[PDB]
Amino acid sequence: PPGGGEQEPPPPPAPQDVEMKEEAATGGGSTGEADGKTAAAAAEHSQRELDTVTLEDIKEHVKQLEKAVSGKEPRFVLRALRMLPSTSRRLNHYVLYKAVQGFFTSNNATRDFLLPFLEEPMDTEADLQFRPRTGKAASTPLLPEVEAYLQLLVVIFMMNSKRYKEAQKISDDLMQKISTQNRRALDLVAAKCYYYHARVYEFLDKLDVVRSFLHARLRTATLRHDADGQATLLNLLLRNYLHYSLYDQAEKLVSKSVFPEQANNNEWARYLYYTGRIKAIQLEYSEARRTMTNALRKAPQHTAVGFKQTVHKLLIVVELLLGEIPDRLQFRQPSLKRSLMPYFLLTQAVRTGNLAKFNQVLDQFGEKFQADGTYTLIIRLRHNVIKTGVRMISLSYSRISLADIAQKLQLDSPEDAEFIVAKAIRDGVIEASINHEKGYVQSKEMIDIYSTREPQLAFHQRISFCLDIHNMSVKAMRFPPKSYNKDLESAEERREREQQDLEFAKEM
Amino acid sequence: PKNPDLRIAQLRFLLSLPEHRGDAAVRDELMAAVRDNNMAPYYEALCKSLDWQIDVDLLNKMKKANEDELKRLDEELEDAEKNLGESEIRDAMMAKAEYLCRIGDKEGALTAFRKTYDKTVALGHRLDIVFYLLRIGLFYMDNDLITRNTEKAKSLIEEGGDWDRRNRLKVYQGLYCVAIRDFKQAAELFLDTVSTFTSYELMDYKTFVTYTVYVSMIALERPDLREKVIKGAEILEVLHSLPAVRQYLFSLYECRYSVFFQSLAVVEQEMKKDWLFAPHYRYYVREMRIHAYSQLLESYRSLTLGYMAEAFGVGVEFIDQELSRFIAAGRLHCKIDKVNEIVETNRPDSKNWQYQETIKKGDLLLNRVQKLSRVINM
Amino acid sequence: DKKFHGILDQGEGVLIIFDEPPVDKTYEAALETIQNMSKVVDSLYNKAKKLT
């Protein structure tokens, strides 16, 4: 009682202070400036909404004695929020429930009491036409239920709160979404609620209802409005199709919405990865390593263990499917020590020419690659290992017996070591012939690749690219010329005085 | 006092990393550690060391004497400012804040040194403070702070000639350029070996001589070796005191290849033992091998492989797996034949390999401005 | 010692002699510009990345 009585009373006192400045000002500008004013010019309440996501992702942890998040829901649910004669008393209602929390006991939201914190959209002049108010102020109690997730009688409360959110969502899906960002703001709010929806209502439940429901939500997209539902409803379409095994990958080939048109460097950024693993499981032909690389270079300053570890893995998984390999562990941050062992230990064996060393990796960490599910792509690397071997030995030795190369490559059989090497000519990994009667394999000395018109092509790939980065550095920098607007000639009165002094010099 | 101070950190290396070697280093490291007021730098060297349970009075007597020096600085400052000389507080701790630099950590050093830097209007103390910052940044390998006071030093090497502050500085650029794997710059900073002096940090001048020959034998080609290190009397008479190193250099120049491996495992083995080399001994001799292969193999075209075992160094299959791993490594320009037992070489033109490094650096800087172009404009 | 260059044969003692002055002047002079501009962009971190 003294330690809780001194340390527990400031928590309400703090956060309520910052929460009368983040989402009270967002309550003033997001509803008063998007439901009534334009928000395409001023949509800063969406990045402010990102701030009021990132505060509350790490804001609540405890089961809330002293009613410091559990007393917010008796406070913040009595919200008409219609107009200033009805919200000027709501500003008092941000203060009266402080007297309810401190003077009295409020209602302790501990896994039982969320339902009287839910049934507010009917009473106290609460409405739904201000879905800037009811979507943000739906999500803001829809979050901290599912933020801790506290898997104990919080899945149906979450669920019914998501049902009220689905009622607001139907009012968005059918009810007057024109030019207000009623649809567009609730594609961010819909988008974020698809994740808690998808954290408690995907793996527990049957996302497959939200497959066809997601075809409805995507169906009303691209017809009426053409942004931000084009973005989220396709990765959110993808994330269990990858996880599962639907045919939508060629659906994603024939899809129109493969562009969502500058989707804000989160959905646009990760979207390239989510379509990268598509052609990974549909046989990388070096096509998507540029978009894996692009998805890596479009990612922010958050951490690597979110997904940047995974794109850092798969991105040169597929380059190991090619044959080229860079160095990977060279930035020992929050991942280039922790998650690299089996993987750098794999490519360590791949950069060698040894055959069963690959097996010495694969038995050692087959289950670890099965923990990522990459194992069905790891299994096919023996082709690339023997390409490394035949390129290595075919580059090193000139006139070598086939009765040595299977022995060095531990292939156990010269009689098809004719045939692996034979395919290695037949594809194009090596040129010259084999005296199959004798046994020696000769290789010609192919030098002067300089005059062999090729590094011109290695140039011409890059000349056009550097002209493109120059021209984009022209196109995205002509903004500056603005504000300042008058370049006066010299003056007016000094021109008149110049006429007077010139008239006196002419009179002289 | 930082003039004997490098042996301390070298013996921290010698205590820590050779795991078998853990007795005499914690003997003599203690011999210098629990005397001369060293207090801060050995708590985690004590973690790597044993418990040493009763260190408490050993701490308290030395932070007690440290408290005595601290409080007599605190007795110095007020009579210092009372009748003023050249701001005699910072004239006191421009001598005793280096005591606090050895004894205390780098912070009580650095705020007193950036403090006292604004006092001495002539560089004759400024550049020595900069040398102290160079030495402690060498100790804690402050790889960004050395880049600062190197240039900040060099800005004060202009006015005057100050070749005891320029040739002295070239030693520091040489030791950092051999800390990093920058060998052709390292011997180039180790060019002189004349104005280099009976220093505090290589108290043997001949240890500096061993260092500059070990880097020079990679860093320069035969034309230079056959003029510079072979005809230098000042470099010759000090390796005249060396039986092994004089043999080690002359085995390569005098085409004595088989004993060159014998001395090579000695020099590489000691380099494996060596602090501030030990990061790159595995890079050293893998270059020495392919360099020695270049020197012998670029004489003939039709040299067989079975000549090199008895003539060069034993082990035919070792020469097989060695050479290949180098033709396979894209260097060592030849093309070995197998089932007639001969080694054939070529000559490459300086047009494809000179192209290769250009596509390396071009793709690298394209990645660079590509990345920064992603950084700006969100 | 490279005062002379060519090759020496061991089969019968034949000195095949050959020479051309290669293009040294172009690619390395273009190359050190690249390592200048690397340091330039490293300075652009010190006026762009920290700044805005």
Binding site: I463, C466, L467, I469, H470, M477 | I376 | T33
Partner: peptide
């Protein structure tokens, strides 16, 4: 390749010269 390679760095440096111009103009001017 070298000339086009330097040209882009030049225009990028002008973009930084533009950013510094508009930013330290928005808060100062208003």
């Amino acid at each position: 390749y070298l000339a086009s390679l330097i040209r882009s760095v030049v225009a990028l440096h002008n973009l930084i010269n533009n950013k510094i111009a508009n930013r330290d103009a928005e808060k100062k001017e208003g």
